[PDB]
A paper describes a structure:
However, we were successful in performing structural study of a newly discovered bacterial RNA repair complex consisting of three proteins named Pnkp1, Rnl and Hen1, which form a heterohexamer in vitro. Therefore, the Pnkp1–Rnl–Hen1 heterohexamer is likely the functional unit of a new bacterial RNA repair system in vivo.
To provide insight into the mechanism of RNA repair by the Pnkp1–Rnl–Hen1 heterohexamer, we soaked crystals with adenosine triphosphate (ATP) before data collection, which resulted in a crystal structure with cofactors occupying all active sites. Guided by the locations of these cofactors, and aided by the published structural homologues of Pnkp1 and Hen1 in complex with nucleic acids as well as the model of RNA in complex with the ligase module of Pnkp–Hen1, we manually docked short single-stranded RNAs into the four active sites located in the inner rim of one ring structure. The docking model shows that, while the reacting ends of single-stranded RNAs (not observed in Fig. 6a) are placed in the active site, the opposite ends point to a vacant space at the centre of the ring structure, indicating that a RNA substrate approaches each repair unit from this vacant space for RNA repair. The 5′ end of the damaged RNA would first enter the kinase site for phosphorylation and, at the same time, the 3′-end of the damaged RNA would go into the phosphatase site for dephosphorylation. Because of highly efficient 5′-phosphorylation carried out by the kinase domain of Pnkp1, the 5′ end would be the first to enter the ligase site, where it could be activated with 5′-adenylation by RNA ligase. On the other hand, after 3′-dephosphorylation carried out by the phosphatase domain of Pnkp1, the 3′ end could make a detour to the methyltransferase site of Hen1 for 2′-O-methylation before joining the 5′ end in the ligase site. With the presence of both processed ends in the ligase site, RNA ligation occurs, which results in repaired RNA with 2′-O-methylation. Among the four active sites located on the inner rim of the same ring structure, the kinase and phosphatase active sites are from one unit of the Pnkp1–Rnl–Hen1 heterotrimer, and the methyltransferase and ligase active sites are contributed from the other unit. Our structure revealed that the methyltransferase site is located between the phosphatase and ligase sites, providing the 3′ end of the damaged RNA maximal opportunity to be 2′-O-methylated after dephosphorylation but before ligation.
Numbering used by the authors:
A (entry chain A): 4 to 123, 142 to 312
B (entry chain F): 219 to 377, 390 to 436
C (entry chain E): 2 to 394
D (entry chain D): 4 to 122, 145 to 312
Write the structure that this text describes.
């Protein structure tokens, strides 16, 4: 080390109603330099209402709060956050959700209940059981501990390639109508992997989210660009379930336990997540997904 | 109000009806669902199913809070413009993710094997287009098909058409004709001197 | 509240061009003082205490709330109910016939509609069967029961036992010793019998009958059938052909839209009333002897902010239709269980919504007026909530 | 094919202050099922702002409006927007930014200014036409930069998070990097890479100071490599720009890049959207 390196800050205001956290913040964002406030209550005011809502709404408000904080923290904007939360399951969670993006800090607002209900309510004390110790928590990463899955190394070496948008760019084509798929263009770098792949003992298995009905226009595309493959695995005709569901079935039924997958090449996120997160397998992501 | 409670009263009611000259086997669940139970049990959860004739009741049941892990998709069809529109409203992502709903039979493309439900249907709407629908279904690549209709002999006991068994049995015979299906019959619901209120066939392809 | 089916209802309120809903009405506040459960006095005094200088007194009619949408072409008028619905299951001929009383009292050059709130009469035009199933059934039961008690030797034998020395011995040495012993009165054998007698509710049989008969008399006046007619009482607003509208805001409109029926009009401001109360009370008691449900009191101008639209005073005779045959007797106990608030809380909202509704011009009603739709749902909630009240007010 | 897929609905309420849009959306939320409001004004209020602020806040607000809308659409949730803009196309950005994510609908609240100030003018004024757009897509090919296909064909590979698993090391103190772990499948790529006419080139953010413990890690797992370009010791500036530089000096126009294996986002973007090279991204890297 030796070096200076700084990340934005997330300042979590922790405390009860009336305890003066929104007042501090109004002063704070007005005098400090690069700060944005995020209030949960202000959010559920776009949806019209007083500050408790449907477990539908509150789950959606969470989805938004988190997105925004991350959105900003990513932008190197400091974020103060008005935790009406106050618990521990909240706090520890809050910390999990955030620290990796920025340096967390805390500011408590304790205040005698005799004084607290004099900010005019509903006479209700909260879970203030001075826990956790509110020591600042610098940014932490957690994950360079990559651990795959214990696949039988007796089974024959094999790689796995997505077709749509990984070995075969659409070039305008309709995503769901892969009949016109012999016009498709080659993502040569992936093509080049599959080449050198089969130069070592590697079985090359094509696994695709195309209707099986479009098998023929596919085999055309493949032999047109001279792709040397072992299996061609395709989605059942009239299936239409999500990609990762039908690909995973395909994986477990066929590939699984019959081969030893050395890695996978794919494009869209939904699928990459499944491969990595559910099946615990190395998968390289070739372009950008987020379809 | 309880299954256990029902267990103690059952023999009593049953014995009472013997002396009146009636063997009755009383059942707690109610003909419907007494039936839907039988179907779910019989088919299983290992093939995707084809739900012919549906307000949605059979679909929810196939999902039961993930308790039955339904891996496949779910094919469902119906003529009622009502049902179709309700099927639509479910594809405003009130779940129904693996629901394909189709109206024209030339829209069912799935070339893979399927388990089939002819809920009530072959009477309580169409008549002898039954010969049609049942014969069309038999051509489909299926594993097991279940068909249910009223017993008509059962009407004695109450207060479209309706076949007796034998009437129904003939219908099935003259739809399989000569193909290598295996076919077994049985009844569902309260039984009185042999007759239940709904008839059943379990057709399995050898 | 089911959203997919409230969405339904609101669309109808819009489709039908309805321009107002309705108030609930709270009864007059108590008078533990005068033992009147709905106090003509304490209900007028409530108002002067809150700023009325002029109030008006209308007879309260026994029918069903009906907003009349009077069109100049009388042929195309319609009727909306207590809540947001059109009434069209009446003889729209026979109805229009009764409405021409009202229609011919006006001048419709350049006036195209006149929204008028009225009582559709009589009770049984929509309420019969609720009359048959509930009200006449309560009556008959009690009346049958009373026949039995009178013809039957029952009350007699009980009274003879209640005299014997075996009993009484029991009711004394048991009023003082507590569930004891055992009460070696043969088990339970006696402890049952003499306890069940004594705890038997006797009834002043004649007084039980007089009570039953008052119920009958009332039910006979209001509850008998039924050639449709109207008792109009307030003009909500007038709608001109020339686009413009006139928000009436006057309950005294009354003496114009029908009802040459005696109302009255007093200026009781700042407790020169009390000396004014004896005349208003003197006439209302003419009204009650005169076979009516009771009386309603309203601020002379229909809408005042933060206010209820009215107070009702149902006489005690009519109230025996509401409470049992024995309201007359257990008068005090129920003055107690009573709280005019809640009603009054809703009674102000309903009206105050109703006026922001009436506020929207006739031309604008429809499914593209989301201020309409908001006020409605708001009003609809008010229903869902107000319905959960005592439901005897 | 005919399955058709169903996407969330984004509904823009176009109108000018007083119209009726926020009163519609009030009814529209309480009566419809799966719908959330996203209003730019309530975000200002979250910063304690009357209306209109520093271009700073305005810019940072925007970054979290798009955040919250996209976050919702991806949870498959219909989203309504009180477009307090409706400008001579401030609509098109709004449409270009989202059409990737949802079926876009509009509802213009038109109203004459004599009525509009039931509490001046607001120009319409357009050839816009409010046709409900479906979902979009695009990114329909890869502009892989014209490369001199005669230079020795070679591949390029990050160390940290790609080939070298930290196993909980200090990512800034690479002195212990020799006791670090191998991401075998990444290494398996470099194995077959060599065996084909490829020069394997390494390229790190490790300051040169920690080169000894690096070369040891490589020897230990017998990694076969041709170049090893690193960070100038005590350079300490953005990981991203260092590699960018090293490439344009050492590798650019001197080799032929077939693809790059990398891990951290910041970098993968640089490869793909600045230098227009193919870049396979082993595993997740959000920092
Ligand atoms: N030191 C103080 N002295 C007097 N009044 C104060 C002080 N601090 C805050 N207040 C007042 O107390 C009231 C509540 O404060 P504030 O709005 O900060 O509550 P809060 O903690 O944000 O509650 P919520 O969770 O509802 O946001 C405000 O009206 C504020 O003006
Ligand atoms: N002169 C009048 N002015 C206003 N309302 C009257 C009048 N005469 C009769 N009414 C009716 O009396 C109603 C309230 O009295 P009543 O107790 O008879 O009905 P209700 O069932 O209590 O109505 P709600 O339950 O909605 O209060 C009014 O809604 C109206 O229908
Ligand atoms: N169709 C309508 N008829 C009558 N009043 C209406 C109607 N729509 C809205 N209003 C009223 O107009 C007032 C302000 O309108 P509204 O709140 O809808 O403006 P807005 O669309 O929110 O504009 P902005 O969000 O840009 O400020 C509100 O008091 C509301 O009650
Ligand atoms: N030829 C046909 N094709 C598709 N549906 C048919 C049909 N003939 C009759 N039907 C349908 O069969 C249905 C039976 S109702 C289904 C019963 C069962 N309780 C369930 O919920 O599943 C009706 O809705 C009717 O429209
Ligand atoms: Mg793909
Ligand atoms: Mg009445
Ligand atoms: Mg890296």
């Amino acid at each position: 080390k030796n070096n200076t390196h700084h990340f934005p800050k997330l300042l979590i205001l922790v405390g009860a109603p009336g305890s003066g956290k929104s007042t501090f913040a109004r002063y704070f964002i007005r005098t400090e330099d690069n700060w944005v406030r995020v209030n949960r209550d202000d959010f559920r005011l776009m949806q019209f209402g007083d500050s408790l809502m449907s477990p539908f709404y509150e789950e959606r408000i969470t989805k938004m709060v988190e997105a925004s904080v991350i959105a900003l923290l990513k932008n190197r904007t400091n974020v103060i956050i008005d935790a009406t939360n106050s618990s521990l399951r909240s706090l520890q969670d809050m910390v999990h959700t955030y620290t990796e993006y920025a340096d967390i800090s805390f500011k408590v607002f304790d205040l005698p209940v005799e004084e607290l209900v004099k900010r005019c309510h509903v006479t209700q004390l909260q879970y203030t059981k001075e826990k956790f110790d509110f020591k600042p928590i610098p940014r932490a990463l957690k994950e360079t501990s990559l651990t795959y899955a214990d696949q039988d190394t007796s089974l024959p070496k094999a790689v796995i390639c997505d077709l749509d948008g990984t070995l075969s760019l659409l070039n305008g084509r309709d995503p769901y109508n892969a009949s016109t798929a012999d016009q498709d263009l080659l993502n040569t770098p992936v093509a080049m992997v599959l080449k050198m792949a089969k130069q070592q003992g590697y079985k090359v298995i094509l696994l695709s989210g195309r209707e099986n009905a479009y098998r023929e226009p596919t085999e055309r595309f493949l032999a047109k660009y001279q792709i040397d493959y072992d299996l061609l695995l395709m989605r059942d005709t009239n299936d239409y379930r999500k990609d990762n569901i039908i690909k995973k079935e395909l994986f477990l039924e066929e590939i699984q336990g019959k081969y030893f997958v050395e890695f996978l090449l794919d494009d869209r996120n939904q699928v990459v997540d499944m491969w990595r997160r559910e099946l615990a397998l190395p998968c390289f992501q070739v372009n950008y997904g987020d379809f | 109000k309880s299954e256990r409670q029902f267990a103690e009263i059952k023999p009593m009611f049953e014995a009472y009806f013997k002396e009146e000259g009636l063997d009755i086997d009383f059942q707690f669940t109610d003909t419907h669902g007494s039936r839907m139970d039988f179907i779910v049990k019989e088919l299983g959860m290992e093939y995707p199913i084809l739900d012919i004739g549906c307000g949605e009741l059979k679909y929810y049941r196939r999902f039961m809070r993930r308790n039955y892990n339904y891996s496949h998709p779910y094919f469902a069809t119906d003529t009622d413009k009502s049902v179709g529109d309700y099927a639509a409203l479910l594809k405003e992502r009130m779940e129904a993710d693996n629901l394909y709903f189709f109206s024209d039979w030339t829209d069912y493309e799935y070339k893979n094997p399927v388990n089939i439900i002819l809920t009530e249907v072959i009477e309580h709407n169409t008549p002898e287009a039954a010969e049609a629908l049942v014969k069309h279904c038999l051509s489909l690549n299926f594993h097991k098909m279940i068909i249910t209709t009223p017993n008509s002999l059962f009407n004695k006991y109450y207060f479209h058409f309706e076949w007796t068994p034998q009437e129904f049995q003939d219908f099935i015979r003259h739809c399989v004709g000569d193909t290598s299906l295996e076919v077994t019959y049985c009844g569902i619901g309260d039984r009185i001197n042999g007759e239940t209120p709904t008839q059943a066939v379990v057709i399995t392809r050898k | 509240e089911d959203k997919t089916l409230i969405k339904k209802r609101i669309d109808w309120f819009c489709k039908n061009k309805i321009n107002a809903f309705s108030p609930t009405i709270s009864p007059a506040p108590k008078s533990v003082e005068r033992n009147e459960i709905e106090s003509l006095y304490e209900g007028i005094l409530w108002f002067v205490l809150n700023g009325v200088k002029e109030i008006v007194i209308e007879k309260k009619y026994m029918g069903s709330y009906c907003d009349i949408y009077l069109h100049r072409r009388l042929e195309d008028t319609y009727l909306v109910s207590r809540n947001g619905y059109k009434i069209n299951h009446l003889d729209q001929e026979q109805c229009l016939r009764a409405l021409q009383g009202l229609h011919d009292r006006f001048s419709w050059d350049g006036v195209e509609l006149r929204i008028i709130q009225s009582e559709l009469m009589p009770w049984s035009i929509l309420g019969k069967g609720l009359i048959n199933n509930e009200f006449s059934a309560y009556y008959i039961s009690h009346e049958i029961h009373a026949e039995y008690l009178v013809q039957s030797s029952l009350y007699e034998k009980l009274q003879k036992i209640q005299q014997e020395p075996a009993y009484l011995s029991f009711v004394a040495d048991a009023k003082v010793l507590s569930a004891k012993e055992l009460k070696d009165k043969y088990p339970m054998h006696i402890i049952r019998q003499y306890q069940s007698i004594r705890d038997f509710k006797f009834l002043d049989l004649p007084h039980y009958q007089q009570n039953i008969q008052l119920f009958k008399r009332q039910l006979d006046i209001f509850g008998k059938e039924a050639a449709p007619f109207f008792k109009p009482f307030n003009i909500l607003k007038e709608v001109y052909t020339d686009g413009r509208e006139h928000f009436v805001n006057d309950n005294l409109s009354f003496q114009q839209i029908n009802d040459d029926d005696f109302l009255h009009y007093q200026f009781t401001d700042r407790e020169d009333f009390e000396a004014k109360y004896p005349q208003i009370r003197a006439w209302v008691d003419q009204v009650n002897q005169s076979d009516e449900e009771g009386v309603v009191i309203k601020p002379r101008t229909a809408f005042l902010p933060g206010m209820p639209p009215a107070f009702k005073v149902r006489n005690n005779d009519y109230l025996t239709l509401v409470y049992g045959v024995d309201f007359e007797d257990r008068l005090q106990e129920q003055i107690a269980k009573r709280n005019i608030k809640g009603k009054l809380r809703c009674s102000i909202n309903d009206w105050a919504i109703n006026a922001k509704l009436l506020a929207i011009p006739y031309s604008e009603l429809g499914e593209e007026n989301y201020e309409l739709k908001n006020l409605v749902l708001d009003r609809i909630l008010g229903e869902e909530i107000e319905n959960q009240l005592d439901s005897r007010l």
